[PDB]
Amino acid sequence: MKFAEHLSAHITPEWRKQYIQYEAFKDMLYSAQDQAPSVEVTDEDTVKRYFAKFEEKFFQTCEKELAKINTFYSEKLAEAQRRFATLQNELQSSLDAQKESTGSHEERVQHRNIKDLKLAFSEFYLSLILLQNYQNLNFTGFRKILKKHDKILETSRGADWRVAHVEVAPFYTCKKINQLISETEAVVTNELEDGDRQKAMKRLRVPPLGAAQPAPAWTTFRVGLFCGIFIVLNITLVLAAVFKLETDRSIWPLIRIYRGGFLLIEFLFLLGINTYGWRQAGVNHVLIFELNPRSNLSHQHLFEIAGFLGILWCLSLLACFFAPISVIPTYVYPLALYGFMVFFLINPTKTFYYKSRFWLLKLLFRVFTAPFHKVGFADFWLADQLNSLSVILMDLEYMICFYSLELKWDESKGLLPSGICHKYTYGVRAIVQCIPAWLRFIQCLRRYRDTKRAFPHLVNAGKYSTTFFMVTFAALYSTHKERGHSDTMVFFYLWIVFYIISSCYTLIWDLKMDWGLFDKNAGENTFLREEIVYPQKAYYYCAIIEDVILRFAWTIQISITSTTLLPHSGDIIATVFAPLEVFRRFVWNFFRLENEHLNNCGEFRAVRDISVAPLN
Amino acid sequence: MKFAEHLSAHITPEWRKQYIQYEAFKDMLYSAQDQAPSVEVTDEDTVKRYFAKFEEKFFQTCEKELAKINTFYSEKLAEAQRRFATLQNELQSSLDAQKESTGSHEERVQHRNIKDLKLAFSEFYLSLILLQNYQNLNFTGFRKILKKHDKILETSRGADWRVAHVEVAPFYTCKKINQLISETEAVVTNELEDGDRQKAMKRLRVPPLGAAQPAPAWTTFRVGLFCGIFIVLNITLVLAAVFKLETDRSIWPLIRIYRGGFLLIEFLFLLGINTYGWRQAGVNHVLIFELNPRSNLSHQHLFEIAGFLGILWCLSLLACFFAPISVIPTYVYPLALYGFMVFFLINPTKTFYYKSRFWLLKLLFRVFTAPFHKVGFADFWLADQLNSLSVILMDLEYMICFYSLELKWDESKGLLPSGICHKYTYGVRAIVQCIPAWLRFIQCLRRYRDTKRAFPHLVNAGKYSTTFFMVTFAALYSTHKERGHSDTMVFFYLWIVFYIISSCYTLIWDLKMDWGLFDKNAGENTFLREEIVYPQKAYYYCAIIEDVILRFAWTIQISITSTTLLPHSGDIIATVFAPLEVFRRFVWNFFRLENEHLNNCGEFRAVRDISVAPLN
Ligand SMILES: CCCCCCCC/C=C/CCCCCCCC(=O)O[C@@H](COC(=O)CCCCCCCCCCCCCCC)COP(=O)([O-])OCC[N+](C)(C)C
Ligand SMILES: CCCCCCCC/C=C/CCCCCCCC(=O)O[C@@H](COC(=O)CCCCCCCCCCCCCCC)COP(=O)([O-])OCC[N+](C)(C)C
Numbered sequence A, B: 001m002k003f004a005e006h007l008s009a010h011i012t013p014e015w016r017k018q019y020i021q022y023e024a025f026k027d028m029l030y031s032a033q034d035q036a037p038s039v040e041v042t043d044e045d046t047v048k049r050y051f052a053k054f055e056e057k058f059f060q061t062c063e064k065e066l067a068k069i070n071t072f073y074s075e076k077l078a079e080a081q082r083r084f085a086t087l088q089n090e091l092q093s094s095l096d097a098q099k100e101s102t103g104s105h106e107e108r109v110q111h112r113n114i115k116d117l118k119l120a121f122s123e124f125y126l127s128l129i130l131l132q133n134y135q136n137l138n139f140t141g142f143r144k145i146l147k148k149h150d151k152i153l154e155t156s157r158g159a160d161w162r163v164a165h166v167e168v169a170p171f172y173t174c175k176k177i178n179q180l181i182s183e184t185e186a187v188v189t190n191e192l193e194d195g196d197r198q199k200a201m202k203r204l205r206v207p208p209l210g211a212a213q214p215a216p217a218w219t220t221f222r223v224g225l226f227c228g229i230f231i232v233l234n235i236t237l238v239l240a241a242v243f244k245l246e247t248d249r250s251i252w253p254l255i256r257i258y259r260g261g262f263l264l265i266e267f268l269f270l271l272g273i274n275t276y277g278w279r280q281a282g283v284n285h286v287l288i289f290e291l292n293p294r295s296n297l298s299h300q301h302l303f304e305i306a307g308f309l310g311i312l313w314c315l316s317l318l319a320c321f322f323a324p325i326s327v328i329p330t331y332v333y334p335l336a337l338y339g340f341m342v343f344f345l346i347n348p349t350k351t352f353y354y355k356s357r358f359w360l361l362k363l364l365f366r367v368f369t370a371p372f373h374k375v376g377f378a379d380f381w382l383a384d385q386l387n388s389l390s391v392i393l394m395d396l397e398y399m400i401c402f403y404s405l406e407l408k409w410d411e412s413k414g415l416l417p418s419g420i421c422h423k424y425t426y427g428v429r430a431i432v433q434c435i436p437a438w439l440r441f442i443q444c445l446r447r448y449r450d451t452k453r454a455f456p457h458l459v460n461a462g463k464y465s466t467t468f469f470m471v472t473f474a475a476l477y478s479t480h481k482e483r484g485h486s487d488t489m490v491f492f493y494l495w496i497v498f499y500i501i502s503s504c505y506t507l508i509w510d511l512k513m514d515w516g517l518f519d520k521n522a523g524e525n526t527f528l529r530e531e532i533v534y535p536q537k538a539y540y541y542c543a544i545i546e547d548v549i550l551r552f553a554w555t556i557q558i559s560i561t562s563t564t565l566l567p568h569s570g571d572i573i574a575t576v577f578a579p580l581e582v583f584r585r586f587v588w589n590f591f592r593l594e595n596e597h598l599n600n601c602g603e604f605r606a607v608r609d610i611s612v613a614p615l616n
């Protein structure tokens, strides 16, 4: 297990088909050696005529692979040649503009131009480094496979073939890449950094990338520590709940308060697994989300954060069950928990994942002001997640109402004991249901405005608009049934029609457009698409089935929450179906990102394009 | 941080002095660059005269280092040349003997030989590999330091100096090592493995060694998980003990039963830190203990075992406090705990560290039959550890006596209920105190017999014999005072004299012989020895002080045990001082192994010699 794993781990995914096929050659050689077509006694033709036809096919395949590698390298080299000239031309103009001006507003745009140029040069350097690594890996693969050939068949043809063709091949000989690498860093050192090579090389240097670097031991230790503490606290919580809770005490406000924290911690834990799967399968989420290719979080850090927050959630709930303090009222523990969560998110000090938190804060500001910002992939993705995390918004609204009105502060234990805050009487609940759908609807309309293409942005707008009709008719039915009016039946039929319409119209879009399945050119992969990234095929069928089932369950949860069913039945339904929506989104993320990535392949794009701004 | 750390981490402990001094050159260069002796009004001559005297000293130092490297390489090459001829001569004879014999007991006097030859060849291969790595690292160091020189002073002298001298140097040019490596594996493949190259290369191949390999993530995760569970269980145990234990209930048998398990877990946990320190500081415990240089436990596995056993200890004690089952008697939990520990040690299946457990089982068999086996370092070391772990033997003996007579089986919860047992009256306490001292005394006598050297083996024999006198006089005093006799005072004076004699005679041996401090050639390191491995010097003084204090405490614990002091006072005294003896041994291990290792340096030893067994 030396080079097959190494080659599999060190390949740039977008060019996966352009590398040498090490596994194919090995298999061919093994099969041939295994099936030695020997003959009775000794036959010259049997043992030497077979070893005069396999080698020719082997060398024909080798020539084909070498030609493919040469063509790809030449094309990428030409592209780099053109890009360097473009960047050089762009860099001349800023200098030309300033010096003349010298011998506020323009200053800030000039600073922005400097930053944009410094980012574009870094991306160019990264592309050059990737091409160099491509050359090195391909040569190593040829050498090792030819040595294995000469070992297996006990002949010296491969050693001479390597010298005759591979060492003469242009991709091995051409030396323009090193000159480009030297020129780029010289220009960055002189023109931008004012002669300081150390700062420029700190910016330009590339560490190991992809799935080729393990996280530090002190992170794995902390992940395990937090997981163990969380497990033991859960066991103790269940035992205390079974053996200490009274029959008369009402637990429903407590459940409605802690549901949101449970959902958040679960969400983070599942997102960690999503990141692990994306990293392992070869899906480049760093390029899609436009993160820094040299500094970004792994799955260990997300596991670390989820466990740390779970410990605090468990401690707060456990202190609410018991009473470790004889003077502090029992209704300040959820307040402390959520205040600490908020302060952890918005900590201004440069500690505890400050870059990640600031990136997320900027993203959240961009999402909640939808019409006035250009829409990227991250904004779409985050608004989709918020579409499934609306039970948290309901829990927050209910907590605010309960603490404002229905809570008796006079009682020593008033956190656990009417009905005003858990119904849609004033209509706030209907609005808080429709906020995230409204954000996605506005984003789709803005995208149509920018692109000026009717399909498929207006179709998304309608898909998100159906929720408004469904919720409106549910609310009308519920408010007419309780007051005893004669129009209950018409609203019932309208609600069921719009329920089925919404469920079908979201499910079809999920299966056909978001995931890109059921393609005409499926071929052997029945009901799937032509190219698939994840290894097993049972994953796709299981995902289709669970999505079909869980799309019907999700719509009923939203309809039921607005005083539809009897309060007792409704509470048990919402609590159980809430985690299943987060599970459905967790499953959806895999294939949405895979379908997005498969577009990058076939265009062979490995680095994000940066467009420097022009002051003049 | 590229090459200084790399060179520090890949150096061979025994030959550390023989490598290039990268840190010295860097410091010299930096100092010179920093204090540039410029003049006022830019004097050209003055500065060019400074840059005509530093370089000459630099190149003189370079020549000295190159000569040292050349001499060391030549000497090691000659040694390898001689060793190969010796092994080849030994290998001819076995073959010569068998073939003639051919054309049970006889099989035994033949089977072991083959194994010994296969081990000797592996050690020879390892030595050759180490020499090759030495060459590579030294050349890389020269190249990088000369490049840094040419960078700092902005001159091209270093580039030409590297070509003129280093590339011509014999240690770089000589190619006999590769021929030796090829010949060794060819001989192993043909003569011993009967032409199967794969099996021979599996035996001969060397993975990364020393402190250059990281433990797998699934081991660190388990270490952290067990540590977290252990912490939470300890907190719960303390809370339950504070809030549930009754005043009338007697806890002393329970403490005396669980003390031994606590001590064992603490010993394993501290042993892990000892291993970590030995690995980091450069002390080669693998060569001293004669373990396999390619497969051996790290500190993570010891942490892993200690945490797993601590979880079971906590669960058993917690179940003893509570009653989670209403039919199982409360006195079977310690039985289950210790039975599981014993079964884990002696599991015959090839699972859960089978090689380590079998090695330890063979070692324990060798220790407990002292006179009939040759004494190595591992036997001495393990008997010393057992000398400090005698409270466990007392706990086992007391548990055996308590269950047999004192416990009342009929009662539902008789585990924690008068005092017929646990008395230094039977005499089954003085003997169990003196068993480990007896084992070490016998080992020292056997050593003297084998080596035929009076010093220092008979001195150790006397040092371990003093314990017999101290314990005997303590027992005589205690048995005469309780029955009211007139000879109490003479035994009191004898006991105090032998107490002070034993304490002084063990402390002096610890400080002067085991650790090798207070040496005549201390020089700058006052009260220490000339060469020291661990970085800080405060460690040695703190260790001396704590050893002086804790040697006086240890002697009183052994004397107090045999019915001297009032039972209530004695119990609190033996529980507090038991962990401190394990801490004292934990501190002692560091410097004992360091003093043993410093002998290997100066002889330049590695790859321990295997004496092949001759069938003859
Ligand atoms: C009920 C009361 C609750 C009270 C509120 C409690 C809130 C407490 C919450 C605390 C959460 C703290 C988590 C920190 C994560 C930060 C983002 C991140 O990880 O980016 C990572 C990318 O990784 C990915 O793109 C995949 C996951 C992205 C995170 C998306 C949001 C996750 C949380 C959704 C939360 C929804 C919240 C609203 C829910 C309704 C790393 O990016 P980077 O490597 O740093 O980028 C490199 C370049 N750069 C650094 C310059 C950018
Ligand atoms: C109450 C009833 C409880 C009964 C006991 C139940 C609990 C005890 C359970 C024990 C579980 C096993 C733990 C490890 C033991 C295996 C040996 C080992 O670790 O060697 C390691 C080295 O490490 C060292 O050289 C330092 C010594 C380690 C421990 C040695 C004895 C002290 C621990 C025990 C003291 C016992 C005290 C007994 C009580 C006084 C690794 O060696 P290796 O890599 O395998 O070697 C490679 C080549 N070879 C494999 C071919 C050799």
Ligand SMILES: O=P(O)(O)O[C@H]1[C@H](OP(=O)(O)O)[C@@H](OP(=O)(O)O)[C@H](OP(=O)(O)O)[C@@H](OP(=O)(O)O)[C@H]1OP(=O)(O)O
Pocket: A001, A002, A003, A004, A144, A148, A151, B197, B198, B201
């Ligand atoms: O010498 P290396 O550079 O380390 O090459 C080794 C080695 O080849 P050699 O034996 O000729 O030295 C292995 O051969 P074995 O000793 O194990 O028989 C070989 O195994 P194969 O016979 O299957 O080629 C293994 O290959 P792998 O790990 O892929 O199984 C391969 O490593 P490389 O792939 O890096 O050449």
Ligand SMILES: O=P(O)(O)O[C@H]1[C@H](OP(=O)(O)O)[C@@H](OP(=O)(O)O)[C@H](OP(=O)(O)O)[C@@H](OP(=O)(O)O)[C@H]1OP(=O)(O)O
Pocket: A197, A198, A201, B001, B002, B003, B004, B144, B148, B151
């Ligand atoms: O090119 P490399 O082989 O990676 O050598 C680098 C590099 O040298 P260059 O700049 O000439 O490429 C660093 O230089 P900087 O860019 O950071 O200025 C240098 O730093 P120094 O100036 O201190 O030599 C660093 O050395 P180090 O990590 O020891 O500080 C050194 O790495 P190497 O030691 O492996 O040569």
Ligand SMILES: CC(C)CCC[C@@H](C)[C@H]1CC[C@H]2[C@@H]3CC=C4C[C@@H](O)CC[C@]4(C)[C@H]3CC[C@]12C
Pocket: A277, A280, A281, A534, A539, A540, A542, A543, A545, A546, A587, A590
């Ligand atoms: C009806 C129910 C049982 C359907 C269950 C579907 C779930 C279990 C399936 C659907 C998609 C699947 C995932 C698809 C992709 C990956 C990435 C791969 O590298 C690890 C397995 C993993 C993470 C799969 C785990 C199992 C999975 C989540």
Ligand SMILES: CC(C)CCC[C@@H](C)[C@H]1CC[C@H]2[C@@H]3CC=C4C[C@@H](O)CC[C@]4(C)[C@H]3CC[C@]12C
Pocket: B277, B280, B281, B534, B539, B540, B542, B543, B545, B546, B587, B590
């Ligand atoms: C009187 C009391 C406080 C004395 C305490 C002495 C203890 C704390 C001292 C004496 C010997 C010391 C150890 C000596 C060697 C090492 C190896 C080094 O790589 C890590 C520190 C470590 C592990 C030291 C830890 C602290 C230490 C254990």
